[PDB]
Amino acid sequence: AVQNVADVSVLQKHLRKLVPLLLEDGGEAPAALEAALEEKSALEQMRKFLSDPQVHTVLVERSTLKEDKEFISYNINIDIHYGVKSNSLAFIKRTPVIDADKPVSSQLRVLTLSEDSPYETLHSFISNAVAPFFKSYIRESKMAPSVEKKIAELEMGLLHLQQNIEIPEISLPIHPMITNVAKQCYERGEKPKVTDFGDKVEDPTFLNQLQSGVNRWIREIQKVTKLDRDPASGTALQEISFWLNLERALYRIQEKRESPEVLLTLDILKHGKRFHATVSFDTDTGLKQALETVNDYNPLMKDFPLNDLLSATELDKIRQALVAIFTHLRKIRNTKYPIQRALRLVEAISRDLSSQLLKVLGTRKLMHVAYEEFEKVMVACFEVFQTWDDEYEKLQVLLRDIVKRKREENLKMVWRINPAHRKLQA
Amino acid sequence: VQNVADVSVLQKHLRKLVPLLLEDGGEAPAALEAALEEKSALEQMRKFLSDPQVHTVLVERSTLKEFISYNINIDIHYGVKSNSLAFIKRTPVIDADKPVSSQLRVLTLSEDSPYETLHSFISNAVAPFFKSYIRESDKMAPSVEKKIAELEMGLLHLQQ
Amino acid sequence: DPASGTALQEISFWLNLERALYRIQEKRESPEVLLTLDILKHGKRFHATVSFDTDTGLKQALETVNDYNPLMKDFPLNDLLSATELDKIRQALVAIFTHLRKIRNTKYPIQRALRLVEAISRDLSSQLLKV
Amino acid sequence: IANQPVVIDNGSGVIKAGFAGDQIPKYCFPNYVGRPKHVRVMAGALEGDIFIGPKAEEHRGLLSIRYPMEHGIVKDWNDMERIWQYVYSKDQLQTFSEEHPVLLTEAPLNPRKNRERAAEVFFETFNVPALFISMQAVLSLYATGRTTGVVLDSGDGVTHAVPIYEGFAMPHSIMRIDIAGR
Numbered sequence: 042a043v044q045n046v047a048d049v050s051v052l053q054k055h056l057r058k059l060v061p062l063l064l065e066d067g068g069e070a071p072a073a074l075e076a077a078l079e080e081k082s083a084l085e086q087m088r089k090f091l092s093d094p095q096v097h098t099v100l101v102e103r104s105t106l107k108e109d110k111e112f113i114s115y116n117i118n119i120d121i122h123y124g125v126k127s128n129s130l131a132f133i134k135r136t137p138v139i140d141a142d143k144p145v146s147s148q149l150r151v152l153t154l155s156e157d158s159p160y161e162t163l164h165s166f167i168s169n170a171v172a173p174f175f176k177s178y179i180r181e182s183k184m185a186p187s188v189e190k191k192i193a194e195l196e197m198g199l200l201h202l203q204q205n206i207e208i209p210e211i212s213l214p215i216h217p218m219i220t221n222v223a224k225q226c227y228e229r230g231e232k233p234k235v236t237d238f239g240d241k242v243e244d245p246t247f248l249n250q251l252q253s254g255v256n257r258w259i260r261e262i263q264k265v266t267k268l269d270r271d272p273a274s275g276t277a278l279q280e281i282s283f284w285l286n287l288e289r290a291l292y293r294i295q296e297k298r299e300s301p302e303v304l305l306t307l308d309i310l311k312h313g314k315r316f317h318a319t320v321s322f323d324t325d326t327g328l329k330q331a332l333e334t335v336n337d338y339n340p341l342m343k344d345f346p347l348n349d350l351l352s353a354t355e356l357d358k359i360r361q362a363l364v365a366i367f368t369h370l371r372k373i374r375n376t377k378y379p380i381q382r383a384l385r386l387v388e389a390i391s392r393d394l395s396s397q398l399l400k401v402l403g404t405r406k407l408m409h410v411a412y413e414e415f416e417k418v419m420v421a422c423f424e425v426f427q428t429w430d431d432e433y434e435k436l437q438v439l440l441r442d443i444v445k446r447k448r449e450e451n452l453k454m455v456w457r458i459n460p461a462h463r464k465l466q467a
Numbered sequence: 468v469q470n471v472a473d474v475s476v477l478q479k480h481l482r483k484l485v486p487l488l489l490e491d492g493g494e495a496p497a498a499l500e501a502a503l504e505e506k507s508a509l510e511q512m513r514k515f516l517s518d519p520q521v522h523t524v525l526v527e528r529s530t531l532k533e534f535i536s537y538n539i540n541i542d543i544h545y546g547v548k549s550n551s552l553a554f555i556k557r558t559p560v561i562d563a564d565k566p567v568s569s570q571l572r573v574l575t576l577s578e579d580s581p582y583e584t585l586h587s588f589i590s591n592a593v594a595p596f597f598k599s600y601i602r603e604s605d606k607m608a609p610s611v612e613k614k615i616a617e618l619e620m621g622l623l624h625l626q627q
Numbered sequence: 628d629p630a631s632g633t634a635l636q637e638i639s640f641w642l643n644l645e646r647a648l649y650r651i652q653e654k655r656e657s658p659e660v661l662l663t664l665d666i667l668k669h670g671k672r673f674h675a676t677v678s679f680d681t682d683t684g685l686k687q688a689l690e691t692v693n694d695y696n697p698l699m700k701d702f703p704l705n706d707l708l709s710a711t712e713l714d715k716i717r718q719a720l721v722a723i724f725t726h727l728r729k730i731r732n733t734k735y736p737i738q739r740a741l742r743l744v745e746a747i748s749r750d751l752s753s754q755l756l757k758v
Numbered sequence: 759i760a761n762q763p764v765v766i767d768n769g770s771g772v773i774k775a776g777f778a779g780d781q782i783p784k785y786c787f788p789n790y791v792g793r794p795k796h797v798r799v800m801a802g803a804l805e806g807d808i809f810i811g812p813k814a815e816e817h818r819g820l821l822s823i824r825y826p827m828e829h830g831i832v833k834d835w836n837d838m839e840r841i842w843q844y845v846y847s848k849d850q851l852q853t854f855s856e857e858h859p860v861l862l863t864e865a866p867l868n869p870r871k872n873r874e875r876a877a878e879v880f881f882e883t884f885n886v887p888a889l890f891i892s893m894q895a896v897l898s899l900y901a902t903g904r905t906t907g908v909v910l911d912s913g914d915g916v917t918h919a920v921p922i923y924e925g926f927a928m929p930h931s932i933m934r935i936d937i938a939g940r
């Protein structure tokens with residue numbers, strides 16, 4: 042219920058008096074701010090801001106246009122969009138419409154959206170104005186525990202966004218009372234024993250909650266151990282790096298497994314004669330077999346010469362690079378490499394070969410040279426192609442004897458490979 | 468990493484910024500002058516501008532009994548009738564010769580409950596900013612946008 | 628009102644009632660409140676004691692909320708309100724009705740349950756209108 | 759997956775239950791259901807109608823004790839539901855019937871409907887993750903540790919002998935009469 046919808050006068054004065062303090066080194070309202078406020082579009086944006094009850098935000102940008110040394114002009118829009126040369130700003134109303142006979146600033150939620158990238162912008166505002174604020178509000182005391190965790194993992198998700206983790210690394214939560222007990226032993230320096238709970242060890246609800254936590258831990262481990270995607274999905278480096286990520290990530294799961302706190306919970310369930318969660322912690326979790334297959338592919342994934350293929354623009358560099366990569370790949374005779382996986386691997390190798398050759402033909406200006414230079418380049422192209430054919434037949438015979446030494450079955454293995462380079466060869 | 472930003476620099480921006488966000492324009496009140504001359508607050512400005520492990524500082528607007536009680540507390544807390552206003556440093560190094568206002572991030576925190584308060588701030592300005600940015604211009608960006616909407620929904624239900 | 632209002636308000640409603648009554652009973656079972664009752668019983672002012680042990684609907688309230696709690700514990704209606712994918716809305720409908728299957732052990736009012744289903748449909752039409 | 763299996767030993771006279779791995783059954787009480795006989799007059803009386811367990815045993819004078827199971831066969835399923843529900847109450851287990859697989863003892867030569875409706879009761883009202891109905895003689899020999907031998911039991915409503923050979927309980931030698939303790 043508001044009968045006094047705020048006049049544009051107080052808002053424009055609030056803009057002129059406050060906004061330059063954030064858009065300058067103190068300073069006053071520039072002439073471009075007055076002309077930017079008197080923009081018919083800006084006036085109707087602020088009028089839709091002060092009149093429409095559903096409108097909450099508005100953007101007051103600090104455009105710094107060059108060669109006018111740079112000019113200072115202001116952009117006003119209700120839509121919020123990030124600028125790279127500008128100190129944008131956001132005004133949120135606490136009310137649906139402002140009653141200006143009180144502080145108009147106390148009915149505005151001035152949030153500064155400066156030129157810092159939105160990733161770290163949201164990270165800064167969350168970690169420094171939401172997590173301690175809202176968490177202190179829950180400290181003074183439900184959706185709130187979930188909201189709390191979403192604050193934490195949302196801001197951490199911005200980090201996952203930036204660094205491109207690609208693999209979920211989820212910690213194993215323990216019951217809080219056990220953490221208080223270990224905290225009490227931590228105040229002294231004593232190792233928190235199993236029988237510290239005493240009578241609490243051989244109780245029903247206690248062991249019940251312990252198995253609940255361990256059961257969720259097993260699901261957290263299995264969430265990422267059995268994970269798999271299409272081997273040809275994405276480029277070659279993506280799949281190869283994906284296997285590498287799985288290797289180090291499964292080692293981190295082993296790290297979370299080997300902590301003494303988790304072992305303390307396991308000791309609780311063992312001392313309480315409950316063998317289920319204890320044996321299932323290693324058997325029901327496929328972490329052991331996942332780590333052994335990871336270790337089988339671990340030297341194969343470390344020191345991969347794909348960079349030899351990255352900065353190779355000369356076809357001779359590509360010749361020697363192709364032979365080098367395949368001779369390093371020759372160690373798949375001892376690590377059980379799959380058939381279809383190797384074939385999609387080969388097509389991924391041909392994908393990057395094609396990409397490199399595409400830019401090579403781009404930087405060649407081949408449609409203007411003479412037949413002497415074009416003939417040399419032509420012969421070099423066929424040189425690379427022949428290195429592919431004969432060395433690929435050597436890899437074929439390699440996998441043939443691998444399947445012979447393994448003696449598994451008579452599958453319908455497709456060797457009718459149409460790679461990414463014959464498309465240009467024809 | 469060249470110098471140390473004195474308390475007086477951000478004191479000037481506080482005495483010139485508080486009237487247009489915590490007061491009704493004009494001059495920094497007597498409570499703000501006493502709060503800015505507080506020895507505790509002096510240490511808070513020194514640790515906020517010259518100590519890389521202090522990301523926050525908050526300038527709370529508390530009212531008790533119809534009594535003005537301003538405060539400068541680095542740790543963020545909530546008072547029922549506290550129309551807080553914080554200063555958040557973007558970068559771990561704040562300068563004095565350079566503009567101190569173009570190196571920080573200012574943010575109010577009204578007397579409303581943090582449910583609708585943080586829902587209003589985050590849900591109203593974070594979503595169009597982040598969405599308009601990533602829908603212009605890496606891996607888990609739309610799912611983290613989904614997480615933003617989930618946090619938004621949780622605060623919405625905490626409010627109603 | 629089980630008829631109007633959002634379904635989420637009802638789920639949160641019963642949970643908040645359990646919290647209130649739980650803290651209430653812990654305040655009641657404190658030795659200080661017990662000793663006040665002991666003093667009144669020693670003073671034989673039975674009006675206070677009998678009225679404290681039978682007039683408050685607390686004993687029946689805890690019973691009723693604990694009978695409704697298994698249906699009310701972890702109701703996944705937020706999933707409809709979570710994703711805009713129509714398949715996610717369908718999966719949410721599936722999980723919600725399988726969670727509503729729990730009425731066999733709750734003795735909740737069937738009429739209130741029907742009104743809850745209609746509130747769910749209000750959420751359904753809301754989410755679909757949104758998407 | 760679940761927390762831990764709950765071994766609920768039935769019996770026409772005394773039900774016995776607890777979690778698996780336990781040494782002795784921590785929760786044992788008679789398999790009867792007592793509801794009051796007299797008239798509730800004074801306020802502040804024993805609230806609630808159906809009583810099971812120690813409270814039904816204590817105020818024994820008021821109740822009109824009946825048995826829902828006789829000769830290892832359930833006669834009333836409602837009282838059995840309340841008994842099992844009582845087993846999962848705060849007085850006996852303080853758990854939920856959604857995180858525990860259930861081992862269920864059962865006497866031989868009983869009708870199929872016992873296993874069928876009992877399974878419906880568990881997997882539907884209780885929604886247990888896993889149910890397993892078994893004999894009783896096989897369990898008694900497993901409790902003694904040896905493996906081949908007959909088992910002579912006489913509980914409260916049934917009595918039978920099962921010649922067990924290494925676990926394979928010979929189904930063609932299970933004599934069973936209905937003259938037991940009760």
Ligand SMILES: Nc1ncnc2c1ncn2[C@@H]1O[C@H](COP(=O)(O)OP(=O)(O)O)[C@@H](O)[C@H]1O
Nearest residue numbers: 767768769770771772773912913914915939940
């Ligand atoms: N000391 C005793 N002497 C004789 N009979 C007893 C004694 N103690 C218990 N009983 C009878 O044995 C029965 C217990 O058997 P029970 O455990 O019910 O077998 P089940 O549980 O397989 O039915 C009780 O009904 C009781 O009547």
